mmCIF file with all atom_site columns, all heavy atoms in Angstrom:
data_model
loop_
_atom_site.group_PDB
_atom_site.id
_atom_site.type_symbol
_atom_site.label_atom_id
_atom_site.label_alt_id
_atom_site.label_comp_id
_atom_site.label_asym_id
_atom_site.label_entity_id
_atom_site.label_seq_id
_atom_site.pdbx_PDB_ins_code
_atom_site.Cartn_x
_atom_site.Cartn_y
_atom_site.Cartn_z
_atom_site.occupancy
_atom_site.B_iso_or_equiv
_atom_site.pdbx_formal_charge
_atom_site.auth_seq_id
_atom_site.auth_comp_id
_atom_site.auth_asym_id
_atom_site.auth_atom_id
_atom_site.pdbx_PDB_model_num
ATOM 1   N N   . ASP Q 1 1  ? 184.397 178.047 167.139 1.00 47.41 ? 1154 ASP Q N   1
ATOM 2   C CA  . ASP Q 1 1  ? 184.646 176.737 166.682 1.00 47.41 ? 1154 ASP Q CA  1
ATOM 3   C C   . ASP Q 1 1  ? 183.551 176.277 165.729 1.00 47.41 ? 1154 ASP Q C   1
ATOM 4   O O   . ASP Q 1 1  ? 182.344 176.283 166.101 1.00 47.41 ? 1154 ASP Q O   1
ATOM 5   C CB  . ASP Q 1 1  ? 184.750 175.685 167.848 1.00 47.41 ? 1154 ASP Q CB  1
ATOM 6   C CG  . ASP Q 1 1  ? 185.832 176.102 168.836 1.00 47.41 ? 1154 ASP Q CG  1
ATOM 7   O OD1 . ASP Q 1 1  ? 185.641 177.101 169.561 1.00 47.41 ? 1154 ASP Q OD1 1
ATOM 8   O OD2 . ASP Q 1 1  ? 186.865 175.342 168.881 1.00 47.41 ? 1154 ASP Q OD2 1
ATOM 9   N N   . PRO Q 1 2  ? 183.845 175.896 164.466 1.00 50.91 ? 1155 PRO Q N   1
ATOM 10  C CA  . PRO Q 1 2  ? 182.779 175.669 163.483 1.00 50.91 ? 1155 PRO Q CA  1
ATOM 11  C C   . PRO Q 1 2  ? 182.214 174.278 163.476 1.00 50.91 ? 1155 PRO Q C   1
ATOM 12  O O   . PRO Q 1 2  ? 182.846 173.322 163.964 1.00 50.91 ? 1155 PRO Q O   1
ATOM 13  C CB  . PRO Q 1 2  ? 183.495 175.956 162.189 1.00 50.91 ? 1155 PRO Q CB  1
ATOM 14  C CG  . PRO Q 1 2  ? 184.857 175.506 162.416 1.00 50.91 ? 1155 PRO Q CG  1
ATOM 15  C CD  . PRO Q 1 2  ? 185.155 175.896 163.868 1.00 50.91 ? 1155 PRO Q CD  1
ATOM 16  N N   . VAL Q 1 3  ? 180.985 174.179 163.040 1.00 51.69 ? 1156 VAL Q N   1
ATOM 17  C CA  . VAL Q 1 3  ? 180.370 172.842 162.758 1.00 51.69 ? 1156 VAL Q CA  1
ATOM 18  C C   . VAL Q 1 3  ? 181.017 172.246 161.591 1.00 51.69 ? 1156 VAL Q C   1
ATOM 19  O O   . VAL Q 1 3  ? 180.807 172.703 160.419 1.00 51.69 ? 1156 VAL Q O   1
ATOM 20  C CB  . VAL Q 1 3  ? 178.835 172.956 162.639 1.00 51.69 ? 1156 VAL Q CB  1
ATOM 21  C CG1 . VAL Q 1 3  ? 178.259 171.580 162.193 1.00 51.69 ? 1156 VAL Q CG1 1
ATOM 22  C CG2 . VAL Q 1 3  ? 178.188 173.440 163.890 1.00 51.69 ? 1156 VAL Q CG2 1
ATOM 23  N N   . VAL Q 1 4  ? 181.808 171.195 161.758 1.00 49.67 ? 1157 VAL Q N   1
ATOM 24  C CA  . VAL Q 1 4  ? 182.700 170.662 160.721 1.00 49.67 ? 1157 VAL Q CA  1
ATOM 25  C C   . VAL Q 1 4  ? 181.868 169.812 159.730 1.00 49.67 ? 1157 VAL Q C   1
ATOM 26  O O   . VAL Q 1 4  ? 181.992 169.938 158.524 1.00 49.67 ? 1157 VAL Q O   1
ATOM 27  C CB  . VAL Q 1 4  ? 183.880 169.930 161.317 1.00 49.67 ? 1157 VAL Q CB  1
ATOM 28  C CG1 . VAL Q 1 4  ? 184.180 168.590 160.551 1.00 49.67 ? 1157 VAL Q CG1 1
ATOM 29  C CG2 . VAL Q 1 4  ? 185.133 170.846 161.301 1.00 49.67 ? 1157 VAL Q CG2 1
ATOM 30  N N   . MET Q 1 5  ? 181.072 168.884 160.272 1.00 48.94 ? 1158 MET Q N   1
ATOM 31  C CA  . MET Q 1 5  ? 180.263 167.981 159.424 1.00 48.94 ? 1158 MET Q CA  1
ATOM 32  C C   . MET Q 1 5  ? 178.887 167.867 160.059 1.00 48.94 ? 1158 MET Q C   1
ATOM 33  O O   . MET Q 1 5  ? 178.699 167.913 161.220 1.00 48.94 ? 1158 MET Q O   1
ATOM 34  C CB  . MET Q 1 5  ? 180.930 166.629 159.273 1.00 48.94 ? 1158 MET Q CB  1
ATOM 35  C CG  . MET Q 1 5  ? 181.962 166.520 158.144 1.00 48.94 ? 1158 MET Q CG  1
ATOM 36  S SD  . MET Q 1 5  ? 182.610 164.849 158.012 1.00 48.94 ? 1158 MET Q SD  1
ATOM 37  C CE  . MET Q 1 5  ? 183.464 164.935 156.419 1.00 48.94 ? 1158 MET Q CE  1
ATOM 38  N N   . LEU Q 1 6  ? 177.927 167.658 159.138 1.00 49.11 ? 1159 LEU Q N   1
ATOM 39  C CA  . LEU Q 1 6  ? 176.522 167.393 159.588 1.00 49.11 ? 1159 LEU Q CA  1
ATOM 40  C C   . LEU Q 1 6  ? 175.884 166.461 158.596 1.00 49.11 ? 1159 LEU Q C   1
ATOM 41  O O   . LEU Q 1 6  ? 175.655 166.825 157.408 1.00 49.11 ? 1159 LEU Q O   1
ATOM 42  C CB  . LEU Q 1 6  ? 175.766 168.737 159.735 1.00 49.11 ? 1159 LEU Q CB  1
ATOM 43  C CG  . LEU Q 1 6  ? 174.388 168.674 160.381 1.00 49.11 ? 1159 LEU Q CG  1
ATOM 44  C CD1 . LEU Q 1 6  ? 174.069 170.078 160.999 1.00 49.11 ? 1159 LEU Q CD1 1
ATOM 45  C CD2 . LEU Q 1 6  ? 173.258 168.277 159.430 1.00 49.11 ? 1159 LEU Q CD2 1
ATOM 46  N N   . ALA Q 1 7  ? 175.604 165.260 158.981 1.00 51.31 ? 1160 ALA Q N   1
ATOM 47  C CA  . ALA Q 1 7  ? 174.885 164.275 158.139 1.00 51.31 ? 1160 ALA Q CA  1
ATOM 48  C C   . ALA Q 1 7  ? 173.412 164.226 158.507 1.00 51.31 ? 1160 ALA Q C   1
ATOM 49  O O   . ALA Q 1 7  ? 172.998 164.477 159.554 1.00 51.31 ? 1160 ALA Q O   1
ATOM 50  C CB  . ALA Q 1 7  ? 175.518 162.884 158.292 1.00 51.31 ? 1160 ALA Q CB  1
ATOM 51  N N   . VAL Q 1 8  ? 172.619 163.884 157.467 1.00 51.71 ? 1161 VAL Q N   1
ATOM 52  C CA  . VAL Q 1 8  ? 171.162 163.645 157.582 1.00 51.71 ? 1161 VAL Q CA  1
ATOM 53  C C   . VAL Q 1 8  ? 170.841 162.337 156.926 1.00 51.71 ? 1161 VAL Q C   1
ATOM 54  O O   . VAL Q 1 8  ? 171.397 161.977 155.880 1.00 51.71 ? 1161 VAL Q O   1
ATOM 55  C CB  . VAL Q 1 8  ? 170.313 164.801 157.087 1.00 51.71 ? 1161 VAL Q CB  1
ATOM 56  C CG1 . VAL Q 1 8  ? 170.651 166.085 157.855 1.00 51.71 ? 1161 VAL Q CG1 1
ATOM 57  C CG2 . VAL Q 1 8  ? 170.567 165.006 155.607 1.00 51.71 ? 1161 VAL Q CG2 1
ATOM 58  N N   . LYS Q 1 9  ? 169.911 161.563 157.543 1.00 51.28 ? 1162 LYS Q N   1
ATOM 59  C CA  . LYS Q 1 9  ? 169.362 160.385 156.897 1.00 51.28 ? 1162 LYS Q CA  1
ATOM 60  C C   . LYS Q 1 9  ? 167.866 160.374 157.099 1.00 51.28 ? 1162 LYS Q C   1
ATOM 61  O O   . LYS Q 1 9  ? 167.383 160.852 158.198 1.00 51.28 ? 1162 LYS Q O   1
ATOM 62  C CB  . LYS Q 1 9  ? 170.009 159.123 157.478 1.00 51.28 ? 1162 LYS Q CB  1
ATOM 63  C CG  . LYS Q 1 9  ? 169.681 157.829 156.695 1.00 51.28 ? 1162 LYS Q CG  1
ATOM 64  C CD  . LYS Q 1 9  ? 170.444 156.644 157.224 1.00 51.28 ? 1162 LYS Q CD  1
ATOM 65  C CE  . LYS Q 1 9  ? 169.967 155.381 156.626 1.00 51.28 ? 1162 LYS Q CE  1
ATOM 66  N NZ  . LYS Q 1 9  ? 170.232 155.232 155.153 1.00 51.28 ? 1162 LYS Q NZ  1
ATOM 67  N N   . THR Q 1 10 ? 167.123 159.815 156.156 1.00 47.46 ? 1163 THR Q N   1
ATOM 68  C CA  . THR Q 1 10 ? 165.704 160.016 156.033 1.00 47.46 ? 1163 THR Q CA  1
ATOM 69  C C   . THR Q 1 10 ? 164.995 158.673 155.874 1.00 47.46 ? 1163 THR Q C   1
ATOM 70  O O   . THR Q 1 10 ? 165.575 157.691 155.400 1.00 47.46 ? 1163 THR Q O   1
ATOM 71  C CB  . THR Q 1 10 ? 165.288 160.960 154.864 1.00 47.46 ? 1163 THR Q CB  1
ATOM 72  O OG1 . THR Q 1 10 ? 165.366 160.239 153.695 1.00 47.46 ? 1163 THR Q OG1 1
ATOM 73  C CG2 . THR Q 1 10 ? 166.156 162.176 154.800 1.00 47.46 ? 1163 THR Q CG2 1
ATOM 74  N N   . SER Q 1 11 ? 163.727 158.706 156.252 1.00 50.92 ? 1164 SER Q N   1
ATOM 75  C CA  . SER Q 1 11 ? 162.904 157.405 156.121 1.00 50.92 ? 1164 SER Q CA  1
ATOM 76  C C   . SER Q 1 11 ? 162.659 157.115 154.629 1.00 50.92 ? 1164 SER Q C   1
ATOM 77  O O   . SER Q 1 11 ? 162.444 155.952 154.322 1.00 50.92 ? 1164 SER Q O   1
ATOM 78  C CB  . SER Q 1 11 ? 161.616 157.561 156.879 1.00 50.92 ? 1164 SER Q CB  1
ATOM 79  O OG  . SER Q 1 11 ? 160.930 158.770 156.521 1.00 50.92 ? 1164 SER Q OG  1
ATOM 80  N N   . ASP Q 1 12 ? 162.668 158.133 153.753 1.00 47.36 ? 1165 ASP Q N   1
ATOM 81  C CA  . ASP Q 1 12 ? 162.590 157.874 152.329 1.00 47.36 ? 1165 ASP Q CA  1
ATOM 82  C C   . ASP Q 1 12 ? 163.746 156.966 151.874 1.00 47.36 ? 1165 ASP Q C   1
ATOM 83  O O   . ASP Q 1 12 ? 163.585 156.014 151.126 1.00 47.36 ? 1165 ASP Q O   1
ATOM 84  C CB  . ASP Q 1 12 ? 162.592 159.190 151.570 1.00 47.36 ? 1165 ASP Q CB  1
ATOM 85  C CG  . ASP Q 1 12 ? 161.267 159.901 151.609 1.00 47.36 ? 1165 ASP Q CG  1
ATOM 86  O OD1 . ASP Q 1 12 ? 160.294 159.288 152.118 1.00 47.36 ? 1165 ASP Q OD1 1
ATOM 87  O OD2 . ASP Q 1 12 ? 161.229 161.051 151.137 1.00 47.36 ? 1165 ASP Q OD2 1
ATOM 88  N N   . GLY Q 1 13 ? 164.976 157.297 152.379 1.00 50.36 ? 1166 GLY Q N   1
ATOM 89  C CA  . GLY Q 1 13 ? 166.178 156.617 151.887 1.00 50.36 ? 1166 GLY Q CA  1
ATOM 90  C C   . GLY Q 1 13 ? 167.286 157.527 151.577 1.00 50.36 ? 1166 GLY Q C   1
ATOM 91  O O   . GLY Q 1 13 ? 168.380 157.061 151.115 1.00 50.36 ? 1166 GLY Q O   1
ATOM 92  N N   . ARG Q 1 14 ? 167.083 158.805 151.755 1.00 48.67 ? 1167 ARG Q N   1
ATOM 93  C CA  . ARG Q 1 14 ? 168.116 159.830 151.387 1.00 48.67 ? 1167 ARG Q CA  1
ATOM 94  C C   . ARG Q 1 14 ? 169.132 159.873 152.474 1.00 48.67 ? 1167 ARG Q C   1
ATOM 95  O O   . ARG Q 1 14 ? 168.899 159.715 153.661 1.00 48.67 ? 1167 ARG Q O   1
ATOM 96  C CB  . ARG Q 1 14 ? 167.464 161.162 151.193 1.00 48.67 ? 1167 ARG Q CB  1
ATOM 97  C CG  . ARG Q 1 14 ? 166.331 161.223 150.188 1.00 48.67 ? 1167 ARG Q CG  1
ATOM 98  C CD  . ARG Q 1 14 ? 165.883 162.715 150.025 1.00 48.67 ? 1167 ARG Q CD  1
ATOM 99  N NE  . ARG Q 1 14 ? 164.455 162.817 149.804 1.00 48.67 ? 1167 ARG Q NE  1
ATOM 100 C CZ  . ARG Q 1 14 ? 163.833 163.990 149.893 1.00 48.67 ? 1167 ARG Q CZ  1
ATOM 101 N NH1 . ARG Q 1 14 ? 164.430 165.109 150.172 1.00 48.67 ? 1167 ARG Q NH1 1
ATOM 102 N NH2 . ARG Q 1 14 ? 162.468 164.008 149.667 1.00 48.67 ? 1167 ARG Q NH2 1
ATOM 103 N N   . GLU Q 1 15 ? 170.388 160.122 152.053 1.00 52.63 ? 1168 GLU Q N   1
ATOM 104 C CA  . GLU Q 1 15 ? 171.520 160.552 152.928 1.00 52.63 ? 1168 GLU Q CA  1
ATOM 105 C C   . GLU Q 1 15 ? 172.279 161.670 152.310 1.00 52.63 ? 1168 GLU Q C   1
ATOM 106 O O   . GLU Q 1 15 ? 172.534 161.638 151.097 1.00 52.63 ? 1168 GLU Q O   1
ATOM 107 C CB  . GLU Q 1 15 ? 172.380 159.392 153.284 1.00 52.63 ? 1168 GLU Q CB  1
ATOM 108 C CG  . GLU Q 1 15 ? 171.743 158.137 153.697 1.00 52.63 ? 1168 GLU Q CG  1
ATOM 109 C CD  . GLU Q 1 15 ? 172.749 157.070 154.070 1.00 52.63 ? 1168 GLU Q CD  1
ATOM 110 O OE1 . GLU Q 1 15 ? 173.951 157.424 154.339 1.00 52.63 ? 1168 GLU Q OE1 1
ATOM 111 O OE2 . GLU Q 1 15 ? 172.398 155.826 154.169 1.00 52.63 ? 1168 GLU Q OE2 1
ATOM 112 N N   . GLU Q 1 16 ? 172.698 162.672 153.097 1.00 52.94 ? 1169 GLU Q N   1
ATOM 113 C CA  . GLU Q 1 16 ? 173.603 163.687 152.662 1.00 52.94 ? 1169 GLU Q CA  1
ATOM 114 C C   . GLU Q 1 16 ? 174.422 164.191 153.828 1.00 52.94 ? 1169 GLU Q C   1
ATOM 115 O O   . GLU Q 1 16 ? 174.011 164.131 154.976 1.00 52.94 ? 1169 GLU Q O   1
ATOM 116 C CB  . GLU Q 1 16 ? 172.833 164.852 152.037 1.00 52.94 ? 1169 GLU Q CB  1
ATOM 117 C CG  . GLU Q 1 16 ? 172.346 164.672 150.632 1.00 52.94 ? 1169 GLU Q CG  1
ATOM 118 C CD  . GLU Q 1 16 ? 171.881 165.938 149.946 1.00 52.94 ? 1169 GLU Q CD  1
ATOM 119 O OE1 . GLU Q 1 16 ? 171.999 167.000 150.564 1.00 52.94 ? 1169 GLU Q OE1 1
ATOM 120 O OE2 . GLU Q 1 16 ? 171.449 165.888 148.764 1.00 52.94 ? 1169 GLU Q OE2 1
ATOM 121 N N   . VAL Q 1 17 ? 175.665 164.662 153.530 1.00 53.56 ? 1170 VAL Q N   1
ATOM 122 C CA  . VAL Q 1 17 ? 176.554 165.211 154.469 1.00 53.56 ? 1170 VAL Q CA  1
ATOM 123 C C   . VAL Q 1 17 ? 177.043 166.538 154.003 1.00 53.56 ? 1170 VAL Q C   1
ATOM 124 O O   . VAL Q 1 17 ? 177.573 166.700 152.897 1.00 53.56 ? 1170 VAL Q O   1
ATOM 125 C CB  . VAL Q 1 17 ? 177.840 164.256 154.667 1.00 53.56 ? 1170 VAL Q CB  1
ATOM 126 C CG1 . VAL Q 1 17 ? 178.622 164.741 155.911 1.00 53.56 ? 1170 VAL Q CG1 1
ATOM 127 C CG2 . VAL Q 1 17 ? 177.378 162.822 154.835 1.00 53.56 ? 1170 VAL Q CG2 1
ATOM 128 N N   . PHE Q 1 18 ? 176.748 167.570 154.832 1.00 52.90 ? 1171 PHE Q N   1
ATOM 129 C CA  . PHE Q 1 18 ? 177.207 168.944 154.503 1.00 52.90 ? 1171 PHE Q CA  1
ATOM 130 C C   . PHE Q 1 18 ? 178.495 169.208 155.290 1.00 52.90 ? 1171 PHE Q C   1
ATOM 131 O O   . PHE Q 1 18 ? 178.497 169.182 156.532 1.00 52.90 ? 1171 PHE Q O   1
ATOM 132 C CB  . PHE Q 1 18 ? 176.147 169.953 154.943 1.00 52.90 ? 1171 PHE Q CB  1
ATOM 133 C CG  . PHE Q 1 18 ? 174.789 169.595 154.411 1.00 52.90 ? 1171 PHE Q CG  1
ATOM 134 C CD1 . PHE Q 1 18 ? 173.784 169.098 155.290 1.00 52.90 ? 1171 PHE Q CD1 1
ATOM 135 C CD2 . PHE Q 1 18 ? 174.412 169.807 153.075 1.00 52.90 ? 1171 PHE Q CD2 1
ATOM 136 C CE1 . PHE Q 1 18 ? 172.508 168.807 154.760 1.00 52.90 ? 1171 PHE Q CE1 1
ATOM 137 C CE2 . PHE Q 1 18 ? 173.173 169.557 152.594 1.00 52.90 ? 1171 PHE Q CE2 1
ATOM 138 C CZ  . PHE Q 1 18 ? 172.211 169.033 153.439 1.00 52.90 ? 1171 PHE Q CZ  1
ATOM 139 N N   . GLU Q 1 19 ? 179.602 169.362 154.524 1.00 52.97 ? 1172 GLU Q N   1
ATOM 140 C CA  . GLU Q 1 19 ? 180.882 169.694 155.094 1.00 52.97 ? 1172 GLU Q CA  1
ATOM 141 C C   . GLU Q 1 19 ? 181.203 171.206 154.917 1.00 52.97 ? 1172 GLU Q C   1
ATOM 142 O O   . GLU Q 1 19 ? 180.836 171.784 153.952 1.00 52.97 ? 1172 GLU Q O   1
ATOM 143 C CB  . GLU Q 1 19 ? 181.997 168.851 154.484 1.00 52.97 ? 1172 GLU Q CB  1
ATOM 144 C CG  . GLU Q 1 19 ? 181.584 167.603 153.774 1.00 52.97 ? 1172 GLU Q CG  1
ATOM 145 C CD  . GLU Q 1 19 ? 182.775 166.893 153.104 1.00 52.97 ? 1172 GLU Q CD  1
ATOM 146 O OE1 . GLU Q 1 19 ? 183.875 167.024 153.630 1.00 52.97 ? 1172 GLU Q OE1 1
ATOM 147 O OE2 . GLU Q 1 19 ? 182.538 166.231 152.100 1.00 52.97 ? 1172 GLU Q OE2 1
ATOM 148 N N   . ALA Q 1 20 ? 181.962 171.710 155.881 1.00 51.24 ? 1173 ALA Q N   1
ATOM 149 C CA  . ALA Q 1 20 ? 182.313 173.124 155.862 1.00 51.24 ? 1173 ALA Q CA  1
ATOM 150 C C   . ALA Q 1 20 ? 183.489 173.305 154.833 1.00 51.24 ? 1173 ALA Q C   1
ATOM 151 O O   . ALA Q 1 20 ? 184.144 172.331 154.375 1.00 51.24 ? 1173 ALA Q O   1
ATOM 152 C CB  . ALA Q 1 20 ? 182.711 173.552 157.258 1.00 51.24 ? 1173 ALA Q CB  1
ATOM 153 N N   . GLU Q 1 21 ? 183.764 174.591 154.575 1.00 51.99 ? 1174 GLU Q N   1
ATOM 154 C CA  . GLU Q 1 21 ? 185.085 175.000 154.055 1.00 51.99 ? 1174 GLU Q CA  1
ATOM 155 C C   . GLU Q 1 21 ? 185.964 175.396 155.136 1.00 51.99 ? 1174 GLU Q C   1
ATOM 156 O O   . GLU Q 1 21 ? 185.680 176.257 155.974 1.00 51.99 ? 1174 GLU Q O   1
ATOM 157 C CB  . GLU Q 1 21 ? 184.899 176.192 153.094 1.00 51.99 ? 1174 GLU Q CB  1
ATOM 158 C CG  . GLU Q 1 21 ? 183.991 175.936 151.880 1.00 51.99 ? 1174 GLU Q CG  1
ATOM 159 C CD  . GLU Q 1 21 ? 184.216 176.923 150.760 1.00 51.99 ? 1174 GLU Q CD  1
ATOM 160 O OE1 . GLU Q 1 21 ? 185.287 177.584 150.691 1.00 51.99 ? 1174 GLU Q OE1 1
ATOM 161 O OE2 . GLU Q 1 21 ? 183.268 177.084 149.935 1.00 51.99 ? 1174 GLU Q OE2 1
ATOM 162 N N   . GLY Q 1 22 ? 187.153 174.748 155.160 1.00 50.25 ? 1175 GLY Q N   1
ATOM 163 C CA  . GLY Q 1 22 ? 188.239 174.928 156.154 1.00 50.25 ? 1175 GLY Q CA  1
ATOM 164 C C   . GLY Q 1 22 ? 188.013 176.058 157.122 1.00 50.25 ? 1175 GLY Q C   1
ATOM 165 O O   . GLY Q 1 22 ? 188.438 177.232 156.895 1.00 50.25 ? 1175 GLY Q O   1
ATOM 166 N N   . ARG Q 1 23 ? 187.264 175.760 158.221 1.00 52.87 ? 1176 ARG Q N   1
ATOM 167 C CA  . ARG Q 1 23 ? 186.928 176.698 159.374 1.00 52.87 ? 1176 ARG Q CA  1
ATOM 168 C C   . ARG Q 1 23 ? 185.761 177.629 159.171 1.00 52.87 ? 1176 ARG Q C   1
ATOM 169 O O   . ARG Q 1 23 ? 185.575 178.531 159.929 1.00 52.87 ? 1176 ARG Q O   1
ATOM 170 C CB  . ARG Q 1 23 ? 188.115 177.447 159.850 1.00 52.87 ? 1176 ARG Q CB  1
ATOM 171 C CG  . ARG Q 1 23 ? 189.345 176.658 160.125 1.00 52.87 ? 1176 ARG Q CG  1
ATOM 172 C CD  . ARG Q 1 23 ? 189.148 175.701 161.311 1.00 52.87 ? 1176 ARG Q CD  1
ATOM 173 N NE  . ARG Q 1 23 ? 189.497 176.401 162.553 1.00 52.87 ? 1176 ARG Q NE  1
ATOM 174 C CZ  . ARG Q 1 23 ? 190.633 176.224 163.160 1.00 52.87 ? 1176 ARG Q CZ  1
ATOM 175 N NH1 . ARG Q 1 23 ? 191.599 175.409 162.664 1.00 52.87 ? 1176 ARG Q NH1 1
ATOM 176 N NH2 . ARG Q 1 23 ? 190.873 176.847 164.308 1.00 52.87 ? 1176 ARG Q NH2 1
ATOM 177 N N   . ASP Q 1 24 ? 185.068 177.503 157.987 1.00 52.12 ? 1177 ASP Q N   1
ATOM 178 C CA  . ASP Q 1 24 ? 183.873 178.333 157.737 1.00 52.12 ? 1177 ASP Q CA  1
ATOM 179 C C   . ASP Q 1 24 ? 182.682 177.396 157.463 1.00 52.12 ? 1177 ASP Q C   1
ATOM 180 O O   . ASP Q 1 24 ? 182.693 176.614 156.583 1.00 52.12 ? 1177 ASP Q O   1
ATOM 181 C CB  . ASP Q 1 24 ? 184.070 179.261 156.556 1.00 52.12 ? 1177 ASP Q CB  1
ATOM 182 C CG  . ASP Q 1 24 ? 182.892 180.118 156.262 1.00 52.12 ? 1177 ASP Q CG  1
ATOM 183 O OD1 . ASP Q 1 24 ? 182.621 181.036 157.106 1.00 52.12 ? 1177 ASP Q OD1 1
ATOM 184 O OD2 . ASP Q 1 24 ? 182.182 179.885 155.223 1.00 52.12 ? 1177 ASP Q OD2 1
#
């Protein structure tokens, strides 16, 4: 079972979300 989404947020002010490719 894959990690579908992973968000990060930072004290600087950055945000990013790394999404998979359909089951990878």
